Amino acid sequence: GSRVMVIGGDGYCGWATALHLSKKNYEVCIVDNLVRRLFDHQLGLESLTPIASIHDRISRWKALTGKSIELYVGDICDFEFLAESFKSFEPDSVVHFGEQRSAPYSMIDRSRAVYTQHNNVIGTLNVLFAIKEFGEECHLVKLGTMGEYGTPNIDIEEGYITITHNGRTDTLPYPKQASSFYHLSKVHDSHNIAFTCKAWGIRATDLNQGVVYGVKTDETEMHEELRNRLDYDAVFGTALNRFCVQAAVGHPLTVYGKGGQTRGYLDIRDTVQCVEIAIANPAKAGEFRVFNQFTEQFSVNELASLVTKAGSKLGLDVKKMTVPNPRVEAEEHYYNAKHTKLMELGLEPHYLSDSLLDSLLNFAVQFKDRVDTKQIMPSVSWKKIGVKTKSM
């Protein structure tokens, strides 16, 4: 074999997924413009883990396993490039990870908010048109986000909700309430994809994924050149990974505001398993499936406590600090999100464990010398965003 095009395959979730699918005997290609690497240079950021070039990564996988992952380097907003890549590779499934995914990045200034929405929304439209024109039976596996739902006072469902209003009943798309220009772009993508499923018969699965944690997967650990990236800065780093690096270097854990912000989380090992399950059990023609892709819910305060306890077993004397919240969001809220569809399809989750935290903390300790502590604290305000292009 089945052929899979992994858009955004040089990135954190995409690289792990591309190797996993190749190991599982799918024919794989990666489509990526490598702009994520340019943003690191522009903002003065760097991965905790040293990573190899995409060309060296692919060459190493071939040297170890004999399998060749094809590479197409270009911007999916350039339709000529996307169309040529689709016609060259002929995918049966497309996994779309190729978007600007950082909420803080989308809030840096007007230019970055506009870039986020243009890049994300137009790139996704181009993918839909390429599938329609060149391979209409191709299944689109799209990375959405649990952030599309916001934090309502009712249970969050997997994409749809059956409502009885004024004596009539209907099943409708779940109301969306995004809290950054990045999260909004995903809501726009999901609405666009749903329309094309109905109008054109597209088959698609929206994976509304929770926050991912971890750096190791079976394939990326096979050789140092296959190593994945691990972000810890305040722009691309996410909560748990950030807390583990902070603990390792002796920085107090950065709890934003009250710390009651609750979200779904999952191990990167489960990201790759879930994508494979969605590919192996495809949506039907005209169907827009929505899966809430996470394994456990945690508040920021709960994460801080877990990291503190794991850190104590390693002699790190972890401390916590309250950072005035750079974001506009609820710091105490109801949260009960449903997640059963992937489990019904066979997901065997790796729940957060003492073993995982010990391994991740030891990993951060091993590379603590590479950590730029100046990038730990957040400097991007949701309220103070302006129009001048900022230089960090």
Ligand X SMILES: O=c1ccn([C@@H]2O[C@H](COP(=O)(O)OP(=O)(O)O[C@H]3O[C@H](CO)[C@@H](O)[C@H](O)[C@H]3O)[C@@H](O)[C@H]2O)c(=O)[nH]1
Number of residues that bind a second copy (CB under 8 A): 54
145 is catalytic: yes
Residues 202-231 that bind ligand NAD (CB under 6 A): 209, 211-212
Pairing of strands 262-267, 296-299: antiparallel
Structural contact between residues 18 and 9, judged by C-beta atoms closer than 8 angstroms: yes
320 is catalytic: no
Residues 92-131 that bind ligand X (CB under 6 A): 101-103
Q: Which of 124, 145, 220, 295 is catalytic?
A: 145
b vs e for 152-170, b when ≥16 Cβ sit within 10 Å of the residue's Cβ? eeeebebbeeeeeeeeeee
Neighbours of 131 (CB within 10 A): 22
DSSP 324: P
Applying CB under 6 A, which part among 26-34, 86-94, 214-222, 333-341 lies near ligand NAD? 26-34
Structural contact between residues 56 and 69, judged by C-beta atoms closer than 8 angstroms: no
Quick check: 101 binds ligand NAD (CB under 6 A)?
A: yes
**Residue 209 marked ligand-binding:** yes
* Structural element, H or E, at residue 193: helix 181-200
- Residue 57 tokens read as 């990564």
Number of residues that bind ligand NAD (CB under 6 A): 27
Quick check: 242 binds ligand X (CB under 6 A)?
A: yes
351 is catalytic: no
Sole residue written with tokens 């990291």: 307
Quick check: 190 binds ligand NAD (CB under 6 A)?
A: no
Applying CB under 6 A, which part among 6-14, 156-164, 198-206, 334-342 lies near ligand NAD? 6-14
Structural contact between residues 378 and 43, judged by C-beta atoms closer than 8 angstroms: no
Compare residues 55 and 198 and give the one whose CB is closer to a second copy.
198
Considering only 83, 222, 314, 323, the residue that binds a second copy (CB under 8 A) is: 83
Instruction: Write the DSSP string, 14-65.
Output: HHHHHHHHHHTT-EEEEEE--HHHHHHHHHT---SS----HHHHHHHHHHHH
Q: Which of 142, 186, 216, 341 is catalytic?
A: 186
CA 308 to CA 225: how far, in whole Å? 31
Structural contact between residues 256 and 323, judged by C-beta atoms closer than 8 angstroms: yes
3-class secondary structure per residue, 121-186 = HHHHHHHHHHHHHHCCCCEEEEECCHHHHCCCCCCECCCEEEEEECCEEEEEECCCCCCCHHHHHH
**Residue 212 marked ligand-binding:** yes
Q: Provide the minimum distance between the beta carbon of 166 and ligand NAD in the complex, in angstroms, as a whole number.
A: 25
Quick check: 36 binds ligand NAD (CB under 6 A)?
A: yes
Sole residue written with tokens 């070039």: 53
Phi, psi of 321 (to 5 degrees): -140, 150
Quick check: 383 binds a second copy (CB under 8 A)?
A: yes
Each residue 296-325 as x (binds a second copy by CB under 8 A) or -, in order, gives ------------------------------
Compare residues 130 and 212 and give the one whose CB is closer to a second copy.
130
**Residue 46 marked ligand-binding:** no
Considering only 14, 214, 311, 326, the residue that binds ligand NAD (CB under 6 A) is: 14
- Residues with Cβ within 8 Å of 333's Cβ and at least 6 positions away in sequence, in order, are 151, 260, 261, 262
Neighbours of 38 (CB within 10 A): 10
Binds 270: which of a second copy, ligand X, ligand NAD, none (CB < 5-8 Å by kind):
none
- Residue 297 tokens read as 């819910």
Rg of the chain on CA atoms, in Å: 20
Considering only 22, 33, 126, 145, the residue that binds ligand X (CB under 6 A) is: 145
Of the candidates 103, 278, 283, the one whose C-alpha atom is nearest the C-alpha of residue 207 is 278
Length of the chain: 392
The binding site for NAD(+) comprises: 12-13, 32-36, 75-76, 101, 119, 182, 186, 212
Interaction site with a second copy (CB under 8 A): 79, 83, 110, 113-114, 117-118, 121-122, 125-126, 129-130, 132-133, 152-155, 161, 163-166, 168-170, 172-181, 184, 187-188, 191-192, 194-195, 198-200, 328, 334, 382-383, 385-387
The binding site for substrate comprises: 101, 145, 182, 209, 239-242, 254-256, 327-329
The binding site comprises: 12-13, 32-36, 75-76, 101, 119, 145, 182, 186, 209, 212, 239-242, 254-256, 327-329
Interaction site with ligand X (CB under 6 A): 101-103, 145-147, 209-211, 238-239, 242, 254-256, 261, 263, 300, 327, 329
Q: Which residues are identified as catalytic?
A: 145, 182, 186
